[PDB]
């Protein structure tokens, strides 16, 4: 496989709604807490990333961040505004039935409280919520041809994602957080032309920074092998890829973010690939729930399960993009992404398939004097 090429002409129409009609599969979910949690303490991510120190330089004021996720149950501390529904034929993105988008939005822009130590990266941003994925709601129709890669649920989500990206760009978002990581085998390619075109439109026509989750391993998402040291022509292991992750693989047009744990090491669930560009805390996280109150778990069969995921990692980096955007308002998306990746805590070898250019360093990103670099990223 090669890096994807973009058909600039194939921008999809600015229309809401799912790719195919959906039905409910599961009861709507509600976040919860781990026993013996202490929300007076700062979340470990806030200390690790030096968020308080970073907020001396910017808060995200004047910046609008689009959260493309499972919807948001808004509150005063997570004051998201409706950005549309791409899962239900009638909705506005302000209904979180999955207990996910709400916590993503709060990591990006959650407001502080006198009664706990939680604050988002960029607490003065405007938040737009577009619901584009859901586990509670799924396509109801059976595929009429099991052999057609373009009728899989994955392909449908890629097509609806493409519309949501155009929609977010047109609503005036300057930063777009995409939680979706559509994974498919390299041997079973999906036609992503509308998605590549939507991304080019959002970034290069509307000037939006797009930050995306690297993806989590699971069913349907299998870890990529590491580069093969004997092929110097292919140091990032493009030829070794077994699983395409999209929109992750549109790097560096987008910034793809992997996850690290408290020990600063790459999370075992973080999807690796030659397109990964940065990393951020993505394990044992704290965020805010449906009333703007601190949560740090979702319910589970054997007990509550901590907040983990590369989408929360991307959220931290989206929040940082918003901080950089306030502080440096004339930088283009490529230049904002350059400040974020250049100032990152780089791994051995400079870059790798797990953390990309390394874990983000908000204070360095807001203060280091570096060359701005080119206005636009090179794309095929």
Measured from the Cβ of residue 124, the count of other Cβ atoms closer than 10 Å reads 17
Catalytic residue, candidates 157, 311, 313, 318: 311
The full DSSP string for 265-313 is SBPTTBPP-TT--EEEE-SSB-EE-TTS-EE-EE--TTS-EEB--HHHH
Helix (H, G, I), strand (E, B) or coil at 365: helix
CA distance 204 to 130: 21
CA distance 369 to 216: 34
Cβ contact 184:149 at 8 Å: yes
Pairing, β 297-298 against β 294-295: unpaired
Catalytic residue, candidates 19, 75, 96, 100: 100
Cβ contact 122:209 at 8 Å: no
Radius of gyration of the chain (CA): 19
Instruction: Reply yes or no on whether 100 is catalytic.
Output: yes
Report the alpha-carbon angle 95-98-100, nearest 5.
95
CA distance 17 to 210: 21
Catalytic residue, candidates 19, 69, 88, 96: 69
Measured from the Cβ of residue 113, the count of other Cβ atoms closer than 10 Å reads 16
Instruction: Reply yes or no on whether 311 is catalytic.
Output: yes
Instruction: Reply yes or no on whether 167 is catalytic.
Output: no
What is the set of active-site residues? 69, 100, 311
């Amino acid at each position: 496989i090669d890096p994807p090429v973009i058909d600039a002409g194939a921008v999809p129409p600015d229309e809401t709604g799912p790719d195919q009609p959906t039905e409910q599969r599961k009861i709507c979910a509600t976040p919860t807490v781990m026993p013996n949690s202490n929300f007076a303490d700062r979340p470990w991510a806030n200390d690790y990333l030096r968020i308080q120190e970073a907020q001396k330089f910017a808060t995200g004021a004047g910046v609008t961040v689009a959260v493309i996720d499972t919807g948001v149950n808004g509150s005063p501390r997570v004051p998201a505004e409706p950005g549309g529904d791409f899962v239900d034929a009638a909705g506005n993105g302000m209904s979180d039935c999955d207990a996910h988008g709400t916590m993503t939005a709060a990591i990006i822009g959650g407001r502080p409280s006198p009664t706990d130590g939680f604050v988002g990266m960029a607490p003065d941003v405007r938040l737009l919520s577009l619901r584009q994925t859901s586990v509670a709601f799924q396509p109801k129709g059976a595929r009429q041809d099991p052999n057609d890669p373009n009728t899989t649920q994955t392909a449908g989500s890629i097509r609806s994602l493409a519309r949501s990206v155009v929609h977010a760009a047109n609503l005036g978002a300057q930063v777009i957080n995409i939680s979706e990581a559509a994974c498919y085998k390299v041997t079973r390619r999906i036609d992503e032309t509308s998605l590549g075109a939507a991304i080019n439109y959002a970034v290069n026509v509307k000037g939006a920074v797009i930050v995306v989750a690297a993806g989590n391993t699971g069913q349907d998402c299998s870890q990529n092998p590491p580069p093969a040291p004997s092929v110097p022509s292919d140091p990032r292991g493009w030829r070794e890829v077994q699983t395409i992750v999209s929109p992750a693989w549109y790097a560096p047009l987008v910034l793809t973010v992997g996850s690290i744990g408290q020990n600063g090491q790459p999370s075992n669930f973080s999807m690796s690939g030659p397109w990964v560009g940065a990393a951020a805390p993505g394990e044992n996280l704290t965020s805010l729930g449906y009333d703007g109150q601190p949560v740090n778990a979702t319910p589970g069969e054997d007990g509550p399960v901590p907040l983990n995921g590369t989408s929360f990692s991307a959220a931290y980096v989206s929040g940082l993009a918003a901080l950089v955007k306030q502080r440096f308002p004339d930088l283009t998306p490529a230049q904002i992404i350059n400040r974020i990746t250049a100032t990152a805590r780089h791994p051995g070898g400079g870059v790798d398939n797990y953390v990309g250019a390394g874990v983000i360093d908000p204070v360095a990103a807001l203060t280091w004097e570096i060359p701005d670099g080119p206005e636009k990223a090179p794309f095929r």
